[PDB]
């Protein structure tokens, strides 16, 4: 829905494997307009 309404914003997913979330975690080392997350993480 971030893509459908106004796609301009820099959106980060944050789900799945430790390796995949680690790859994204290092991006926020601003161009991170939202991160999409869940409470267990």
């Amino acid at each position: 829905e971030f893509t459908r309404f106004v796609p301009k914003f820099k959106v980060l997913p944050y789900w799945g494997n430790p390796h995949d979330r680690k790859v994204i975690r290092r991006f926020w080392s601003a161009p991170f307009h939202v991160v999409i997350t869940s409470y267990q993480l």
């Binding site: 997913p13 995949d20 994204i24 991006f27």
Partner: peptide
């Protein structure tokens, strides 16, 4: 003498961001 150290600096400076961004573009779909 520093140029051989500088060419190593610029190629790794692009390779760093390149691989991370390439993985980002493969990931998000």
């Amino acid at each position: 003498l520093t140029e051989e150290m500088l060419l190593k600096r610029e190629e790794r400076a692009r390779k760093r961001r390149l691989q991370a961004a390439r993985r980002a573009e493969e990931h998000k779909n």
